[PDB]
Design a protein around this nucleic acid. Structure first.
Ligand SMILES: Nc1ncnc2c1ncn2[C@@H]1O[C@H](COP(=O)(O)OP(=O)(O)OP(O)(O)=S)[C@@H](O)[C@H]1O
Ligand SMILES: Nc1ncnc2c1ncn2[C@@H]1O[C@H](COP(=O)(O)OP(=O)(O)OP(O)(O)=S)[C@@H](O)[C@H]1O
Ligand SMILES: Nc1ncnc2c1ncn2[C@@H]1O[C@H](COP(=O)(O)OP(=O)(O)O)[C@@H](O)[C@H]1O
Ligand SMILES: [Mg+2]
Ligand SMILES: [Mg+2]
Ligand SMILES: [Mg+2]
Ligand SMILES: [Zn+2]
Lengths: 395, 310, 209, 105
DNA sequence: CGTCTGCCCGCTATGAGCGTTGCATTTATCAGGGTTCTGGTCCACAGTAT
DNA sequence: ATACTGTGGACCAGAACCCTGATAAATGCAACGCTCATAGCGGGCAGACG
């Protein structure tokens, strides 16, 4: 599944991180000056590509959405929070000084008596913390998380011990708010990231749901799972009779009793689940003006995007009118901003006019982006009653 | 299996396999047997296990633990290794690497006493405090499960509780401290505690790996020792002075407890068979008693070296 | 390993390990009935071989696959149409093994994501997407989530074809409207006799031939 | 009513009414082969009419019943010979009700 | 105010998930034999009494 | 010096665990039935124009 990395131990300068192998085998923390440049990506554009055939220049344009990433202000904060809550969940699970072994003995009682509040030892404490991410659709929650978690080795192997530390894992909810198909998703991800077979071992012998919930929290401690991410938590609203509260409590017990940190990602529609009953981060689309002066983020984004053109008769520089129409049509949602550019270039190639103007942008938006019109119209209106249905803005 | 625990210091492999199913939440013994071994015909044995090699395969990446280290460091093999001889030691070592369980016991004929006895799960309540304050875990220790001494070489008696190894054949059991605490003082004998302390350093001695005498070396050693000691008849025993020394060193109650009560009247005695020409291997108790009664100032390893070199 | 060792030593400040693939592309083709949406696809995809065999490897690359939605609107029958069609493209049997009644929708949807990577599929086109509405198996929100989680797993691109009544199915929320028009949306119209102020040339060309 | 909870519980010492009492005795017979321990018993018991039907009630009193121990010494066959001999002398079908189902002793 | 227009509404058919059942498989019980293993036994020899 | 006491040594037969076969009893799995949500048609009954 994933390549194992033999661990080399470093020397952390923090007193609390004294002799914990699980947080000396991790890559070092980085400063914010280089954390905003370790995530940047772009496409090559060799200068000889402007003279190639139209079919090649058309198949090269299509890879812009998949290879262009620009770090923003909030990505640094999210990265720092993730790093702290990954390295802070191991201080209570030291494997050397008899502290992880006190957690694995308690877990056998839980799987044996079928209850998650059964304890044998009382000095086995856990520190996990938690997070919750909320933003509109297309804002970039998952593509800016796969990029952040891409600096960690996932599976690591220690020779002094015989443990395979799994640094992070990622799953998502079922299409209904089912209970038996989240445990199986966890097992499938776990044995697809290692190569083992836990879906045949657990979960195919006709266990009750409580037994499965007890077995899920023990194999997550056999391999020291540093972080768990559940994507699309808004699927929980369609749960069974009273089942929405059960897993909402279960994701609280693991953070509090077992010790595994948990992160949740969702849309504004998923705020209602938590409102009825975790830290909160709210993400919103780019605003053109917030200080009374043009936003530097928008200028930087458009200026860096504009330099990725394969058109022969390309414009010298981006004029104000093109920027204004680009913001008018897209309103700041990340996916539309790049897709509109890609489609405009793809039409300019075939139509014969190898340039970009405001009229071409409007025509492409009118022709090829029909299903997305009402949501962007509601965003442009700026009326709370219209946004009360869809458009995914938190009131 | 992905995460097989490394053995703790001075632990039997039975406890390691038992913990390898507590660390992962396997409750039914058949599932644990099917995962670790792949067969449901294996028999749990405390001391002198078989089917080794599959245990060394799980600990392959940690380069240190091989079959030799598991055999000579985490079992009871060194108690039987030197006294049997050079002829059967290699065969037993070869046999323990494969799927022959009872054949190993047959080859180690001193352990081939047909039905055994005292299969109850022993423990020492004083050592468990150190185990919990040093490791956070409690496990079976090779000091406790001596073949015939229910005594700890550093604290005294052992607290039994009535669960038998052969009660459930396919189940690996791990000690739990909440169940464990049933300490009550018992009668204690200082002579047997001293014997246990004398016999303990044999387990952690590297000399027993490559040094083992033969039967004629044993009888030559005994006859030279008797002749130099001076309490002998004409090429025979006095039968009284040696027995008197044995009774002076050890009380009759101790030998009655050890199931080696002296029998002066009958012609067939274990001491007499020791003196006469050797025909079969003897247990460690008889050799230890003879050495202690006849050599009161020499250690076990040096005594064995003296017996084997000449 | 070399990058990890050097970043731990301190020579190299940054290193990027393995990452995850992006969401699959998707397209929506909407047009009135009788316009030729099945004929066009069957003539366009006919230039591509279906099953190509690679000698150095041991994969039978299934270049494309075509299935159709079920009249019930059921979500568990469009998981068996996949196996049934792939057993005809190849000579294998998968509806006998993975098409049991013990497995749920969430398990079949993950079993069909492994045989779509053993044989590297290139497309999955679903025809007659109109038949989804008013299904007794579940609500509208239990299928608008099934589509999102099916796009976010399989990895192969998907193409959806339907009549102009299927606009209201995918125009209910931004999460599904963004994915429906993943690579543009194509709307088809009947031929017009008069284009601007002069007679059409396409109509005359089609009629004369 | 006392016998229903013995079926439910599985323990044959429970009770609901303390007033219920038993008034039965026991007998044992041993003799060498050829003495006539079977034909004499048959001749003695042939006086009574076995099944008798009552009209005011609806019961069918069974005066006596004879079974034999299985050769194998099995514990599940003595409980099946009883049902076979009962539905042979009544015409009912109790072996299918009780014997066929998965029941412990 | 009553039959037609809306309304109610009991009813009916369908499908995905969960709980139950019968057959084949595994597991356990018991008798028989046997084959080497070892455990006590008797014979011949050395050294001592007439 | 030579005949009797003690003893070393070579040694057979009871016996314990392993292998084989036949019969009875305890599980595991593939198959089948129970239950809950969802959609709709048509008939029978509260308020209409006449
Ligand atoms: N900072 C960024 N720079 C460039 N492209 C970005 C950036 N953030 C997001 N994107 C684009 O956003 C798209 C990915 O969208 P997602 O990250 O999946 O949105 P989302 O949050 O997953 O929406 P859902 O359906 O609610 S999960 C790609 O086209 C990326 O190129
Ligand atoms: N008083 C008797 N008069 C005539 N014949 C008798 C008498 N008692 C016994 N018999 C005969 O003896 C036989 C009765 O013995 P069985 O019916 O075989 O029972 P049994 O004597 O208990 O032997 P078992 O049941 O095998 S131990 C029949 O052949 C009878 O005809
Ligand atoms: N461009 C075309 N040229 C010739 N015939 C066409 C064309 N487009 C459609 N047709 C005819 O229309 C008929 C019906 O098309 P069909 O495949 O049923 O489309 P749909 O399934 O969308 O109705 C076909 O038999 C085909 O012959
Ligand atoms: Mg996403
Ligand atoms: Mg068609
Ligand atoms: Mg009779
Ligand atoms: Zn002790």
């Amino acid at each position: 599944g994933a390549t194992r990395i033999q661990a080399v131990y470093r020397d952390t300068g923090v007193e609390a991180y004294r002799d914990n192998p699980f947080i000396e085998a991790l890559p070092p923390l980085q400063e914010s000056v280089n954390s905003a440049a370790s995530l940047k990506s772009s496409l090559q554009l060799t200068s000889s590509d402007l003279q190639k055939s139209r079919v090649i220049r058309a198949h090269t344009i299509c890879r812009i959405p998949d290879d262009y990433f620009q770090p923003l202000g909030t990505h640094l904060l999210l990265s720092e929070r993730i790093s702290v809550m990954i390295r802070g969940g191991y201080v209570g699970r030291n494997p050397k000084t008899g502290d992880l072994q006190k957690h694995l003995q308690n877990g056998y009682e839980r799987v044996q008596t079928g209850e998650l509040e059964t304890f044998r030892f009382e000095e086995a404490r856990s520190t996990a913390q938690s997070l919750l991410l909320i933003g509109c659709s297309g804002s970039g929650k998952t593509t800016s998380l796969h990029r952040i978690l891409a600096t960690y080795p996932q599976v690591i192997y220690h020779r002094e011990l015989n443990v395979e530390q799994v640094v992070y894992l990622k799953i998502d909810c079922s299409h209904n708010g089912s209970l038996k198909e989240i445990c199986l998703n966890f097992f499938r991800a776990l044995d697809r990231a290692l190569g083992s077979n836990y879906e045949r071992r657990y979960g195919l012998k006709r266990h009750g749901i409580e037994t499965m919930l007890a077995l899920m929290s023990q194999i997550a401690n056999a391999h020291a799972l540093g972080l768990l991410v559940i994507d699309e938590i808004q699927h929980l609203s369609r749960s069974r009779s009273g089942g929405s509260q059960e897993m909402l409590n279960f994701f609280v017990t693991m953070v509090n009793i077992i010790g595994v940190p948990v992160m949740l990602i969702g849309t504004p529609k998923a705020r209602e689940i938590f409102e009825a009953d975790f830290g909160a981060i709210f993400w919103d689309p780019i605003q053109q003006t917030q200080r009374g002066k043009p936003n530097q983020e928008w200028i930087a984004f458009t200026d860096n995007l504009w330099q990725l053109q394969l058109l022969q008769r390309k414009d010298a520089l981006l004029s104000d009118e093109v920027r204004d129409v680009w913001y008018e049509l897209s309103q700041g949602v990340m996916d539309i901003v790049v897709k509109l550019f890609v489609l405009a270039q793809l039409r300019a190639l075939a139509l014969g006019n190898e340039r970009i103007t405001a009229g071409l942008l409007r025509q492409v938006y009118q022709d090829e982006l029909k299903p997305v019109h009402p949501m962007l119209e509601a965003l442009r209106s700026g009326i709370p009653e219209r946004i009360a249905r869809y458009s995914d803005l938190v009131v | 299996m992905r995460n097989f625990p490394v053995p703790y210091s001075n632990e039997l492999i039975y406890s390691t396999i038992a913990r390898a199913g507590v660390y992962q939440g396997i409750v039914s013994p058949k599932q644990l047997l099917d995962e670790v071994y792949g067969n449901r015909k294996v028999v749990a044995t405390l001391g002198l296990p078989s089917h080794l090699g599959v245990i060394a395969r799980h600990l392959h990446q940690t380069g240190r633990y091989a079959v030799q280290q598991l055999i000579y460091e985490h079992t009871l093999f060194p108690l039987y290794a030197p006294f049997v001889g050079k002829e059967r030691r290699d065969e037993a070592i070869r046999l323990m690497e494969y799927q022959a369980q009872g054949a190993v016991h047959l080859m180690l004929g001193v352990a081939a006493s047909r039905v055994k006895s005292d299969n109850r799960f022993r423990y020492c309540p004083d050592c468990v405090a150190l185990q919990l304050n040093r490791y956070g875990e409690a496990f079976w220790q090779r000091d406790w499960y001596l073949p015939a001494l229910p005594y700890c070489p550093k604290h005294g008696a052992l607290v039994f509780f009535d669960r038998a190894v052969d009660d459930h054949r396919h189940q690996f059991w791990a000690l739990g401290h909440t169940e464990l605490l049933s300490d009550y003082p018992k009668d204690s004998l200082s002579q047997l505690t001293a014997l246990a302390a004398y016999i303990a350093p044999l387990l952690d001695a590297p000399r027993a790996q490559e040094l083992s005498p033969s039967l004629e070396q044993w009888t030559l050693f005994y006859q030279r020792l008797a002749q130099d000691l001076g309490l002998t008849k004409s090429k025979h025993i006095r039968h009284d002075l040696v027995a008197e020394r044995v009774r002076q060193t050890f009380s009759d109650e101790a030998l009655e407890k050890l199931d080696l009560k002296l029998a002066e009247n009958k012609d067939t005695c274990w001491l007499k068979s020791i003196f006469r020409k050797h025909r079969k291997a003897f247990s460690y108790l008889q050799h230890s008693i003879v050495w202690q009664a006849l050599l009161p100032k020499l250690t076990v390893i040096e005594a064995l070296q003296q017996a084997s070199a000449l | 390993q070399n990058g990890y060792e050097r970043v731990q030593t301190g020579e190299l400040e940054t290193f990027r390990f393995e990452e995850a693939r992006s969401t699959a592309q998707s397209l929506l083709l909407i047009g009135c009935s009788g316009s030729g949406k099945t004929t066009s696809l069957h003539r366009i995809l006919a230039t591509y071989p279906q099953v190509i065999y690679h000698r150095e490897l041991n994969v039978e690359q299934v270049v494309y696959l075509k299935i159709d939605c079920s009249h019930n609107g059921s979500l568990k029958e469009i998981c068996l149409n996949f196996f049934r069609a792939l057993d005809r493209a190849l000579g294998s049997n998968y509806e006998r093994r993975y098409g049991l009644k013990r497995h749920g929708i969430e398990t079949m949807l993950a079993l069909m994501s492994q045989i779509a990577n053993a044989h590297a599929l290139g497309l999955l086109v679903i025809d007659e997407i109109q038949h989804l509405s008013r299904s007794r198996s579940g609500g509208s929100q239990e299928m608008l989530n099934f589509f999102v989680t099916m796009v976010n797993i399989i990895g192969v691109p998907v193409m959806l074809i339907g009549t102009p009544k299927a606009r209201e199915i995918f125009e209910a929320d931004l999460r599904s409207a963004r994915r429906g028009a993943g690579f543009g949306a194509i709307f088809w119209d009947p031929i017009q006799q008069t284009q601007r102020g002069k007679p059409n040339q396409e109509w005359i060309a089609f009629t004369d031939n």
